[PDB]
Amino acid sequence: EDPQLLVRVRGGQLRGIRLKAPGGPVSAFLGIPFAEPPVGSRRFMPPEPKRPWSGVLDATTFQNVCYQYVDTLYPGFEGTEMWNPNRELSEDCLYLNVWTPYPRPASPTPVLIWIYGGGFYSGAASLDVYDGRFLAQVEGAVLVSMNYRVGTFGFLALPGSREAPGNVGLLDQRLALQWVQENIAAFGGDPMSVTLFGESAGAASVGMHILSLPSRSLFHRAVLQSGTPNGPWATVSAGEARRRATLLARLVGCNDTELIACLRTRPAQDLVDHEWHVLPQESIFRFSFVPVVDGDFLSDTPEALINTGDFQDLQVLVGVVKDEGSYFLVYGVPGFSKDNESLISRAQFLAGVRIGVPQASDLAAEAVVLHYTDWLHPEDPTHLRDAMSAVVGDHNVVCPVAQLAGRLAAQGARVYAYIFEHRASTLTWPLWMGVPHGYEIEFIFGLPLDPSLNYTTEERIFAQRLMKYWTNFARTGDPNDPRDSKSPQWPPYTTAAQQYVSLNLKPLEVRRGLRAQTCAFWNRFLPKLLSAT
Amino acid sequence: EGREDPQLLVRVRGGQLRGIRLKAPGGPVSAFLGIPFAEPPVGSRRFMPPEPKRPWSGVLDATTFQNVCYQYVDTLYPGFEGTEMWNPNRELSEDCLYLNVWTPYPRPASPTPVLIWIYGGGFYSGAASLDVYDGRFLAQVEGAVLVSMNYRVGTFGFLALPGSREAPGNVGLLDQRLALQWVQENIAAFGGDPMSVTLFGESAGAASVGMHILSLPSRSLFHRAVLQSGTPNGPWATVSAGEARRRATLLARLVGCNDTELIACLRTRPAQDLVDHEWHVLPQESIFRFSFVPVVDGDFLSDTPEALINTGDFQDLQVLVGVVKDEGSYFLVYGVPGFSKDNESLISRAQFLAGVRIGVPQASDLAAEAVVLHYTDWLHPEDPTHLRDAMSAVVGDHNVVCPVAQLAGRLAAQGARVYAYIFEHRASTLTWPLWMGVPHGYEIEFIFGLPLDPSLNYTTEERIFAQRLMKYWTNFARTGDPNDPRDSKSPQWPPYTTAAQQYVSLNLKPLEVRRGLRAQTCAFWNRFLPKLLSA
Numbered sequence A: 001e002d003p004q005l006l007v008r009v010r011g012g013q014l015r016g017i018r019l020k021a022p023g024g025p026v027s028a029f030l031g032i033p034f035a036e037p038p039v040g041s042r043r044f045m046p047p048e049p050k051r052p053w054s055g056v057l058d059a060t061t062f063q064n065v066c067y068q069y070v071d072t073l074y075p076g077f078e079g080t081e082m083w084n085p086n087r088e089l090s091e092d093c094l095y096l097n098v099w100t101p102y103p104r105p106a107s108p109t110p111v112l113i114w115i116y117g118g119g120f121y122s123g124a125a126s127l128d129v130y131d132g133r134f135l136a137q138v139e140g141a142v143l144v145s146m147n148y149r150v151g152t153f154g155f156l157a158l159p160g161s162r163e164a165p166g167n168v169g170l171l172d173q174r175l176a177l178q179w180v181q182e183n184i185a186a187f188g189g190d191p192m193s194v195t196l197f198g199e200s201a202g203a204a205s206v207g208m209h210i211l212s213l214p215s216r217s218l219f220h221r222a223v224l225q226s227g228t229p230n231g232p233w234a235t236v237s238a239g240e241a242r243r244r245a246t247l248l249a250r251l252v253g254c255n256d257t258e259l260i261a262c263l264r265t266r267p268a269q270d271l272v273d274h275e276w277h278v279l280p281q282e283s284i285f286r287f288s289f290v291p292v293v294d295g296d297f298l299s300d301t302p303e304a305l306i307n308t309g310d311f312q313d314l315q316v317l318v319g320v321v322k323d324e325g326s327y328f329l330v331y332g333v334p335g336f337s338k339d340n341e342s343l344i345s346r347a348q349f350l351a352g353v354r355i356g357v358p359q360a361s362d363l364a365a366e367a368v369v370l371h372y373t374d375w376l377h378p379e380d381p382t383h384l385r386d387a388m389s390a391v392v393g394d395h396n397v398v399c400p401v402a403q404l405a406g407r408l409a410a411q412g413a414r415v416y417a418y419i420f421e422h423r424a425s426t427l428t429w430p431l432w433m434g435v436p437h438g439y440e441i442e443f444i445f446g447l448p449l450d451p452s453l454n455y456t457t458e459e460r461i462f463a464q465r466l467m468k469y470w471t472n473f474a475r476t477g478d479p480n481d482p483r484d485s486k487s488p489q490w491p492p493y494t495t496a497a498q499q500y501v502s503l504n505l506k507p508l509e510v511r512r513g514l515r516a517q518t519c520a521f522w523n524r525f526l527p528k529l530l531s532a533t
Numbered sequence B: 001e002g003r004e005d006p007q008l009l010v011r012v013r014g015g016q017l018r019g020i021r022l023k024a025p026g027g028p029v030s031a032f033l034g035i036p037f038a039e040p041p042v043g044s045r046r047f048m049p050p051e052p053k054r055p056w057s058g059v060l061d062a063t064t065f066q067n068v069c070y071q072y073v074d075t076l077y078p079g080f081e082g083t084e085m086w087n088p089n090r091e092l093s094e095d096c097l098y099l100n101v102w103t104p105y106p107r108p109a110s111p112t113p114v115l116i117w118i119y120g121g122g123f124y125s126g127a128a129s130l131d132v133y134d135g136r137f138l139a140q141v142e143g144a145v146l147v148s149m150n151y152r153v154g155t156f157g158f159l160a161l162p163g164s165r166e167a168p169g170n171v172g173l174l175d176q177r178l179a180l181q182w183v184q185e186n187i188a189a190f191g192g193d194p195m196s197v198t199l200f201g202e203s204a205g206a207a208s209v210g211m212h213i214l215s216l217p218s219r220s221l222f223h224r225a226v227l228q229s230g231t232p233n234g235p236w237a238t239v240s241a242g243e244a245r246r247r248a249t250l251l252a253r254l255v256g257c258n259d260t261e262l263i264a265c266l267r268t269r270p271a272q273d274l275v276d277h278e279w280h281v282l283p284q285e286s287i288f289r290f291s292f293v294p295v296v297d298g299d300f301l302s303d304t305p306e307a308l309i310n311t312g313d314f315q316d317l318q319v320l321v322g323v324v325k326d327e328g329s330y331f332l333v334y335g336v337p338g339f340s341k342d343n344e345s346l347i348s349r350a351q352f353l354a355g356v357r358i359g360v361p362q363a364s365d366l367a368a369e370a371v372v373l374h375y376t377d378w379l380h381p382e383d384p385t386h387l388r389d390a391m392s393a394v395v396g397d398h399n400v401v402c403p404v405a406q407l408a409g410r411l412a413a414q415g416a417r418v419y420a421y422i423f424e425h426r427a428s429t430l431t432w433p434l435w436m437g438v439p440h441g442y443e444i445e446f447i448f449g450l451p452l453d454p455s456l457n458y459t460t461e462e463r464i465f466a467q468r469l470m471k472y473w474t475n476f477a478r479t480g481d482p483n484d485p486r487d488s489k490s491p492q493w494p495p496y497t498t499a500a501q502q503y504v505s506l507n508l509k510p511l512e513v514r515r516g517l518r519a520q521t522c523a524f525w526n527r528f529l530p531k532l533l534s535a
């Protein structure tokens, strides 16, 4: 019985496990319950805090993955399987994980809290790419990750109702953040220094805690990687959530109380079986059950809240990868596949745009096509393919990120922005996809430091650089190394200069304007268009 | 006769002419100036199609330029060479239908390719007698036979009550057509080859050349064409029949006037009264918009220039087209608040937004906003210098560059051999401020060879540049190809194609080939804005 592996938290005693990291041991406390299992009459309901337990709770293994759809498009392919559940599925999944250095930190250590992505319909804190042992061992960080409900279980809503108020998945995350405030000191983490970080939906989630007052006293800094609370996919209106919910009810055969009561009797997989049949149009980068503008967790739309918020005492790091949209193209656009170079025709490009920008009118879709066509090579298949990727990546991530960076900076926040451009030597997706959505993560978590994973020695040095930026940012709100001249320095993003840095194998390079002309098209012109026509 | 220079006596269908021997840097040239080609379109003839000049007796003196067609005279900058060089240089009169011919001295041995110049001036001004249109250099150095004609402008040449008998519209274009017929019948008397006639012009002169290409009856009067900074398609070269009727009747009201009665009353008004109200009929405050221009009458223009260039067969046609580096600058000081030739014209964002409404007068609020968003440099959205140059670009692209890009593309896709250029050299002698760059109209003095005149103070490189350009234009007139058949060394000027979109830069440096004439931006004007319009 190793005393470094024994901790007492408000609910009782835990026993963690000593894990091996390249440079030494780390202490890990896996599968800690933070809420009562949201099962049975608790489905669709806000989480309740976990009741105290007797004895010593075993926290040496990952708990179950929240019930969710499992990808089958490319069976056996590592590019997709790496995101699939790696533990048993179950609605009983509200558990979090903590990694800390071994022996546990002498003094209070800044805490990093990871919120995974997966379109709000999938993901889990147990995936290999979210392994917190590297950051814990190399930087001495206390890393926390929680499971939160996805899909219908976490976001199906009958707005205004008592039994499916919506956003419970964000409330699960909030409860895990409260748990960190109340218990993280027992592990040597500083509750006064908590940095939230996440990617994609995880990033939009971090964004939603920034915009919801009750979350604000639970963290101090934030990192949003390829995702935002604003934008076309992260939220839906009350009306649309109600619409998708009742359409799902109907599809499984079911006054809000009775509808929800009937939904609660259905096996989990029945709900997942019809999840994807409620989207209003054929599309990509669109998810059935996501946060809802409820006038509660989200007092107004993310757009309204970021345009009028006071972000004075907040530091934020945000960024995108080089090819945000490639990955999504193979999941719905005719002509695209991971197995060929996906050289498409102009006709397939125009078709792709209606799928890529599903809420777009014919005039608006025409404007997108004319803006993205390279008029010197309007029929070149390679140009048309890369353009289709750009349309999807810009519309969904880059421009919504440029928009958020700008409002937070204009309104008092300290902002740092980046563009990640290194393509992992180990990537299994084809070259035409470039640096896809989600592939910067393994670097920030430091996986290249595991010699058995076969990353190049340059990638290992790169990952160390990134872990430093993130942890420096967590410690101080500034990603630059405190004692180190010559770098060059990563400057704050501002509305005036619009500076951001490229993260790749070469030293930091400062650039200006995040797709400035193109995002002006998405952020200023298209809005003006559709609100008139 | 008896003692006169035997090389200056020539006979044409209407009678005997006596020209004058003029001095050109490299030697003498023969000039026949002020040859009447139509009956004076005065009195009951105002607004009427021209009638061929009736024969005269004796020897008509053709030694000086004739009257300039009645027109508005610019006074915005009194005394300034930049504006005066375009002003009338001979008496104003409605009796102005005369043309000019320059030919080598002694006249060429065998038939020489003919170049016919059609001046610009927004269809409301101009004259073939201006110094920049002096044909003595092309005649002396390239042995060209050059012809230029005066054609009616303003109300006198384009006021129309479409469908009427007394003001059919497009008579100024008919004046030009009459002069082209005069060349077919008489140019051989001067040594010119009527079977090799190339039309060239700038701005409204260029749109004019374009209208002769789209009008069947003019097609048999020429073989090749050059359009400098102008097109028959675009926002200013033509108006609909309804709009022309509207402007004509509003002008009639302003001077105190059934079409016959209205026109008859207009004919009693002094020429100067019509000029004094010419600018009061435009529908919106604007720049690069002219009151009386060619009308889509369903006769001279069977349909809109857009329709005709989209559906025409341009199989056996060779065309040279181009623009200058800063097509819009000149126009900004005639109506956009914040611009002046006397200061740097650094403007604010608000002045830019206001300038766009004036520069794109037909644009809806949404369309004007799309223009502003497209032209704004989002890394420095408030920088005065960028906003100023952007205002110039908006005007130049909307009115000249994109309409030219559009024309080249349709002509090429439909059988024509097209050559395209962008002229980027700023005359060392320009008197407009530097911020205007190479303004609209300033490639002309180089194409005509004025730098070859030692007394005009051009640099020696400009003199060599002028010679290069004169060779390109005359080679094109001779063969339909600007390239010198011998010289393989000099890079070649390749044809413009929808596939490759090649065009050359014309400046002091050797030809440089470039691809895509403002391709992204012209896609905005030529493809997106129209579609915005359908809603």
Ligand SMILES: *[C@@H]1O[C@H](CO[C@@H]2O[C@@H](C)[C@@H](O)[C@@H](O)[C@@H]2O)[C@@H](O)[C@H](O)[C@H]1NC(C)=O
Binding pocket: B337, B338, B339, B340, B342, B343, B344, B345, B346
């Ligand atoms: C540039 O000039 C514009 C028009 O002003 C006129 O021209 C200048 C040169 C003076 O002679 C003045 O008396 C005239 O009224 C101004 O509207 C514009 O703001 C000026 N730009 C600046 C700020 O210098």
Ligand SMILES: *[C@@H]1O[C@H](CO)[C@@H](O)[C@H](O)[C@H]1NC(C)=O
Binding pocket: A334, A335, A336, A337, A339, A340, A341, A342, A343
């Ligand atoms: C790529 O493969 C998909 C299906 O496997 C097909 O629809 C598409 O046309 C292919 N494209 C190419 C490059 O042939």
Ligand SMILES: *[C@@H]1O[C@H](CO)[C@@H](O)[C@H](O)[C@H]1NC(C)=O
Binding pocket: B455, B456, B457
């Ligand atoms: C040309 O330069 C001479 C010498 O400076 C000067 O006297 C003359 O006025 C100039 N003429 C022109 C065209 O500017």
